């Protein structure tokens with residue numbers, strides 16, 4: 388026995404949510420809380436001091452933004468409860484919580500303590516009847532409806548590649564990199580001070596993030612493309628100010644393939660990705676050549692998959708046809724896939740009742756992990 | 758169960774994307790095996806000398 | 807050729823193989839043709855003996871895995887309870 392569950396597609400930057408069997412996440416709001424810088428002695432103005440969404444984005448000025456979650460590992464768990472309480476807002480739910488099944492998201496390569504504390508929240512502070520969350524890549528595959536695939540997510544500062552054969556991942560061939568657009572914008576901030584500009588405020592930095600997402604693409608041959616002169620079509624701020632560009636429009640996003648240039652013993656998404664592919668079956672790579680699942684919204688770049696095709700030619704196999712799946716609802720793919728799963732009578736076997744948590748809890752977490 | 762207004766609401770609830778809940782509601786009904794038992798032992802129930 | 811090896815301590819082993827070939831060359835004398843013919847057969851036998859050793863090498867990797875594989879599709883383990891339930895996603899694609 389249950390109610391209609393809700394799929395909460397936790398984007399590393401923007402969390403999303405929405406009831407079962409639907410097509411579009413009901414809510415789409417980010418992951419940070421602002422608190423006012425200035426206080427007042429005046430009587431009659433606003434209250435709250437904790438805002439997320441249009442309230443925060445509305446009056447960004449005093450609300451000092453702080454991202455509580457880092458690579459899934461959140462440190463403001465209490466504030467996450469407040470965030471989920473905000474998910475239970477009047478404008479948000481007006482529903483109950485201890486009487487409905489739900490669905491959140493889970494990326495791999497994580498400490499169990501996160502799931503442990505999560506169960507503590509939803510089953511100590513809440514009394515959720517049944518709830519089970521699994522690997523996000525399968526949800527993307529649900530959106531595809533394709534047995535095998537190479538899913539690559541793209542969070543704000545989180546990325547990971549997973550190959551799955553008919554609903555079976557490869558634990559010995561799954562990789563992850565701790566970065567996405569987060570340090571890309573931070574690196575753009577670096578470029579800003581490289582040519583003398585600081586955008587040290589939190590909101591200011593998110594504005595920089597929006598600028599990045601607004602004007603950035605991929606180049607063909609980076610060192611050869613460096614030989615030209617960027618004309619820097621200046622954009623003009625909401626404040627009304629000159630915005631130069633530099634190589635940032637193409638150089639800054641390729642930091643992903645130059646972690647040594649940023650200071651990290653890593654190689655590249657496609658590099659370690661194809662390495663894990665090499666660790667897979669001699670035969671399944673053939674399937675994965677056409678089964679290339681693109682996911683995550685950080686992927687929005689001109690010639691993104693095209694430069695990725697160039698990367699494929701860099702890591703060329705022994706002449707075998709390859710194909711990439713590049714949909715348009717890559718962020719929504721996981722939410723919709725969960726909605727598909729949430730629209731299944733198979734969750735009876737795929738769930739864990741709260742009574743099970745009452746009986747064991749931690750042991751149910753360890754044993755009934757997946 | 759044969760009341761048309763409740764069945765009407767059931768059809769609209771199905772239409773409201775909650776097909777699983779509505780189907781599960783009627784699968785909860787063991788009226789099928791109940792009535793087959795009714796008529797199974799009914800000649801042993803009724804007309805008993 | 808002719809091969810017939812057999813082992814039967816708890817397991818049947820019936821090794822039978824051969825190779826039959828023919829060549830031709832013009833007669834010179836006794837010594838030349840002697841070392842010629844025997845050298846040809848000699849190398850062919852040693853050659854095929856080596857081929858048999860490599861055939862054993864082809865057994866371990868091809869033959870076995872051609873019939874009885876060693877690893878799963880994930881090539882690592884088998885969760886029997888996962889087979890007992892969950893319905894892993896047999897209705898996605």
Ligand SMILES: Nc1ncnc2c1ncn2[C@@H]1O[C@H](COP(=O)(O)OP(=O)(O)O)[C@@H](O)[C@H]1O
Pocket residue numbers: 397398399400401402540541542543544545567568599600601682683684685686687688718
């Ligand atoms: N124009 C754009 N170019 C590149 N990235 C973008 C653009 N617009 C939005 N994004 C990205 O969409 C991504 C959504 O990330 P997130 O919701 O954290 O993904 P995930 O669901 O993989 O965690 C963000 O990382 C943000 O940088």
